[PDB]
């Protein structure tokens, strides 16, 4: 009688449901999502223009169709507003749902930045398919986009929006693209690639204010530059959605704290994907999420299983400058050395023993992904 309840129809929620349904085809399944519930791959949002897709072209299946495939009831445009761990239930306004086990697959939230002026709200995040639809709606017939952020997500969009015909101005107070993730020299090559497409960078300033001016907007940066634009993309970064878990008394840190079995601090509640911090590791990518779905499915079907991340390199979708990066796992030190020249750069991180523990590859140098991957240590020891 008691359902498995999954909050989320992203890649985490849908892949868990699918992996689990190979194991248990009888237990009722309820899926709940705040969006339209359509199946789609979020990674593809940053390639839509180069593939000449609109939002609907990126949808792979309607939620009703998924409901048949998974033998599930799927509630769409339904916001869970609380978790009641002491009574094994969740809240949706003033209605409740009992669960057998609850799975939190509710993702991460865009990082807001303070902006002034009478247009300070005209900032478009792109963190799901509906966001993408709302951005495309606003961008029709426009020429210029201001983009806030210079991480992986910001760089991918800047690349695709440029291929899509838009003239981009990227603003970010960090000193390099993809800070934290990327060695300076390889970041420089990626930035150069994007500039080659016409992207203009402003690294160091923030957006001070946004005002309505004539045909569109004027963006006043903190250094006094005024940049005419039609709309603004907010892609500063992401942080795991923790508010509802913490209020419910679940342990949180960077994300929702789970062990290698994906269990939270409370019986019958698990978490996976962008929202989950797995044994200290909150990794906002598909590869660890897939490992988690496979293991958690087993546990939910009564076969206690753990994840164990091997090497999980990051493939950055910037066609203007191809990039694959694998930062060294946490607790490991080494020296960085830049081999190659120009756009074809190979930056290796070696321990004292001479072993490659991390890398960044740009241009032609991405071909040697596979040979380097064999030497790599896992993200979990």
């Amino acid at each position: 009688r008691a359902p498995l309840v999954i909050i989320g129809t992203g890649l985490a929620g849908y892949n868990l449901a699918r992996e689990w349904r190979k194991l248990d085809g009888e237990t009722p399944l309820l899926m709940i999502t705040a969006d339209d519930g359509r199946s789609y791959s979020k990674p593809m949002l940053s390639t839509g223009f180069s593939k000449n897709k609109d939002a609907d072209g990126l949808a792979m299946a309607e939620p009703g169709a998924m409901a048949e495939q998974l033998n599930a009831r799927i509630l769409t445009h339904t916001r869970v507003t609380g978790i009641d761990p002491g009574h094994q239930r969740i809240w949706i306004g003033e209605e409740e749902v009992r669960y057998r086990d609850l799975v939190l697959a509710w993702g991460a939230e865009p990082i807001r930045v303070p902006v002034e002026g009478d247009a300070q709200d005209a900032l478009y995040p792109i963190n799901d398919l509906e966001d993408y639809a709302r951005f495309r709606q606003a961008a029709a017939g426009k020429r210029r986009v201001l983009l806030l952020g210079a991480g992986l997500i910001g760089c991918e969009f800047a690349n695709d929006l440029s291929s899509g015909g838009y003239q981009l101005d990227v603003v970010a107070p960090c000193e390099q693209v993809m800070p934290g993730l990327l060695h300076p020299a390889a970041a420089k090559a990626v930035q150069a690639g994007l500039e080659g497409l016409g992207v203009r960078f402003h690294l160091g300033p923030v957006l001070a204010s946004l005002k309505k001016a004539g045909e569109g907007l004027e963006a006043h940066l903190s250094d006094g530059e005024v940049i005419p634009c039609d709309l603004v993309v907010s892609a500063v970064g992401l942080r795991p959605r923790t508010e509802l878990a913490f209020a419910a008394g679940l342990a949180v840190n960077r994300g929702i704290v789970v062990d290698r079995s994906l269990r939270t601090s409370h019986a019958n509640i698990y978490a996976l994907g962008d929202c989950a911090e797995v044994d200290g590791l909150n990794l906002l990518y598909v590869m660890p999420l897939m490992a988690c779905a496979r293991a958690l499915a087993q546990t939910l079907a009564g076969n206690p299983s753990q994840v164990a991340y091997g090497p999980m390199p990051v493939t950055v979708k910037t066609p203007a400058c191809p990039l694959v990066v694998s930062p060294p796992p946490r607790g490991m030190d080494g020296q960085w050395l830049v081999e190659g020249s120009g756009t074809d750069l190979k930056v290796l991180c070696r321990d004292t023993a001479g072993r490659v523990i991390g890398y960044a590859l740009t241009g032609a140098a991405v071909n040697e992904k596979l040979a380097l991957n064999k030497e790599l240590p896992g993200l979990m020891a």
Partner: protein, 53 residues
């Protein structure tokens, strides 16, 4: 020979080339690739690939 693309990240498996370091020889058909095999770039199963050309 056919090309198969990952619907999740866009990884292209080319039947003509194979993935010799996986290690899958050149000329290996999609059906003759082990069932447990995953996308090297995002980790989804064979179910998330579609034949493009």
């Amino acid at each position: 020979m056919r090309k198969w693309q990952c619907v999740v990240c866009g990884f292209i498996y080319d039947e003509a080339l194979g993935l010799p370091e996986e290690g899958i020889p050149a000329g290996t058909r999609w059906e003759d690739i082990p069932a447990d095999w995953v996308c090297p770039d995002c980790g989804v199963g064979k179910i998330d690939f579609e034949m493009i050309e």
